Amino acid sequence: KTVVVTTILESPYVMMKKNHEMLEGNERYEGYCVDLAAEIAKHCGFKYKLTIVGDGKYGARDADTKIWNGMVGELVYGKADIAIAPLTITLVREEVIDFSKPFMSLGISIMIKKGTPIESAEDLSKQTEIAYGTLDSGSTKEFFRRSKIAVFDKMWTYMRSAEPSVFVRTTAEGVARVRKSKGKYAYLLESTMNEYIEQRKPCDTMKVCGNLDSKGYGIATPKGSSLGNAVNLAVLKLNEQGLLDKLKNKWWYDKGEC
Amino acid sequence: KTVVVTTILESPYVMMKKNHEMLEGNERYEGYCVDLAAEIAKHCGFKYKLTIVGDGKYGARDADTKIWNGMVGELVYGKADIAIAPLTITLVREEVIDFSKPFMSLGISIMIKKGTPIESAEDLSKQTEIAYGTLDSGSTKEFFRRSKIAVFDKMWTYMRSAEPSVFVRTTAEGVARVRKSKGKYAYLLESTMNEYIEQRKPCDTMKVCGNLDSKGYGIATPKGSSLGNAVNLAVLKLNEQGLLDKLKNKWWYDKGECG
Numbered sequence: 001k002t003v004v005v006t007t008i009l010e011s012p013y014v015m016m017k018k019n020h021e022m023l024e025g026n027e028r029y030e031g032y033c034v035d036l037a038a039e040i041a042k043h044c045g046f047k048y049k050l051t052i053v054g055d056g057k058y059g060a061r062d063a064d065t066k067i068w069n070g071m072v073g074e075l076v077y078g079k080a081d082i083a084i085a086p087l088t089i090t091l092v093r094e095e096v097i098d099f100s101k102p103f104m105s106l107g108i109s110i111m112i113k114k115g116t117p118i119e120s121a122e123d124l125s126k127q128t129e130i131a132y133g134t135l136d137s138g139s140t141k142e143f144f145r146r147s148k149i150a151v152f153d154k155m156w157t158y159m160r161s162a163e164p165s166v167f168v169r170t171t172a173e174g175v176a177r178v179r180k181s182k183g184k185y186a187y188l189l190e191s192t193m194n195e196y197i198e199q200r201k202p203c204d205t206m207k208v209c210g211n212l213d214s215k216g217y218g219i220a221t222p223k224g225s226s227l228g229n230a231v232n233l234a235v236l237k238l239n240e241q242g243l244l245d246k247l248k249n250k251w252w253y254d255k256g257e258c
Numbered sequence: 259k260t261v262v263v264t265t266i267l268e269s270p271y272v273m274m275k276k277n278h279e280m281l282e283g284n285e286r287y288e289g290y291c292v293d294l295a296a297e298i299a300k301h302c303g304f305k306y307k308l309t310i311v312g313d314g315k316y317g318a319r320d321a322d323t324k325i326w327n328g329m330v331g332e333l334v335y336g337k338a339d340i341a342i343a344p345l346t347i348t349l350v351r352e353e354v355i356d357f358s359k360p361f362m363s364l365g366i367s368i369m370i371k372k373g374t375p376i377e378s379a380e381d382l383s384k385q386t387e388i389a390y391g392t393l394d395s396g397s398t399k400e401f402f403r404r405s406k407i408a409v410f411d412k413m414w415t416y417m418r419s420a421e422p423s424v425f426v427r428t429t430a431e432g433v434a435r436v437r438k439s440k441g442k443y444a445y446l447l448e449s450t451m452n453e454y455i456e457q458r459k460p461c462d463t464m465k466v467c468g469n470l471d472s473k474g475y476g477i478a479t480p481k482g483s484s485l486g487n488a489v490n491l492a493v494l495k496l497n498e499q500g501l502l503d504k505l506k507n508k509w510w511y512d513k514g515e516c517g
């Protein structure tokens with residue numbers, strides 16, 4: 001039958017076209033992840049439908065109830081066959097879903113307003129005038145929640161107890177908060193997105209050099225999926241043929257403005 | 259009567275058109291700095307000739323002889339009326355020529371082959387398997403020669419004594435050397451040029467995060483010349499109306515080829 005692909009509205013992975021109200025089906029969407037889905041579906045020879053995760057979340061596990069939300073929940077509870085998104089491979093998610101080999105590399109990173117005196121997480125941790133936060137339900141929050149490294153536990157400790165909340169619900173809200181804070185808010189986010197925002201107008205944010213960690217995005221499928229193997233191979237082939245590099249160039253750097 | 263403009267072939271500031279062999283005079287050339295000259299000559303109303311500096315160099319002073327070469331020398335000894343090129347504003351050059359206000363900002367940067375394990379200039383300084391070098395007679399060489407920062411001084415000492423020479427005569431030679439070295443050569447160059455090349459075919463180069471310094475390009479004229487003020491006056495006006503930003507966009511990002 002047709003494969004249900006869950007994914008998430010996160011520029012430049014998946015974005016709405018300007019005139020999407022005049023378009024239908026998978027043609028409503030464009031982006032790196034839309035192009036990757038097209039290629040994987042070609043190399044695996046299946047038909048697919050792109051769907052946007054209804055809760056708009058990546059995926060995390062509720063501690064009290066052990067239930068998954070976001071794209072992970074869609075796979076675990078059978079609402080979708082495959083997730084194609086900037087979805088971070090992590091040990092905890094690996095317990096309930098299967099990931100392909102990485103199609104992209106990234107690390108947690110810092111975004112500041114051009115001008116802000118910050119060069120590192122250690123600078124952030126040792127001061128208080130500049131507030132910092134993360135997206136409210138992703139691998140970046142969890143990295144800090146679970147870190148045993150002193151700088152990062154201190155940062156998590158400050159972030160969990162800050163009033164008002166330093167967490168945001170969307171990358172766009174975090175970026176907006178950086179722009180509006182006169183250099184008084186730094187946004188902790190993945191380097192691929194930090195890089196994308198850096199080269200878009202109004203060109204007032206900067207990505208601090210040096211990531212806090214190093215990891216990858218994978219295509220995810222449910223445990224037991226017959227699709228699991230074909231998608232892994234599709235990822236490796238497209239990396240061999242250089243297509244992953246071309247799409248990254250296509251969506252990040254071709255369209256720069258700074 | 260005609261204003262002689264000295265400049266240098268550096269993509270995307272100044273380039274030969276694909277069909278330059280069918281053209282003559284100022285029509286052989288294209289690029290950011292070509293457009294800027296055409297516009298500056300409009301707002302000041304003079305006719306000009308574009309010339310490519312004969313020694314192909316930006317400009318340096320011989321220690322023993324105190325004589326300048328390159329585009330700086332063309333201005334100091336009266337072979338040209340004005341230089342319009344990615345010519346870096348520096349204190350030692352200001353002793354002998356007049357610079358406009360910056361028309362563009364940049365920093366020293368690092369170019370590697372996609373794959374190379376280098377994350378910073380400090381990383382370069384601490385190892386031996388990967389060679390690095392600069393253009394042989396410009397501000398980037400002098401920045402390193404003169405730096406009181408330990409890493410950059412460690413880098414100059416390695417570069418000057420390295421065998422074979424890690425220095426190159428043209429930006430293109432430095433870029434070619436990166437591609438041909440399987441990640442065994444890193445090229446230290448200015449950020450505007452590194453960024454343009456990164457998104458040009460064959461798309462096998464990368465710019466390390468973080469510039470090593472911050473400085474600007476200026477239009478140069480000879481010391482005392484009346485054309486200096488007339489041309490600076492043109493520089494700032496056209497930025498206010500976005501002319502500089504339009505040319506920056508027109509020549510840099512429009513022209514990607516790696517997606």
Ligand SMILES: N[C@@H](CCC(=O)O)C(=O)O
Binds near residue numbers: 058138
């Ligand atoms: N890529 C992350 C979302 C972004 C973030 O957590 O900063 C995830 O899969 O949870």
Ligand SMILES: N[C@@H](CCC(=O)O)C(=O)O
Binds near residue numbers: 317344396398
């Ligand atoms: N703009 C430099 C040339 C480029 C470089 O040294 O990297 C100069 O004015 O000498």
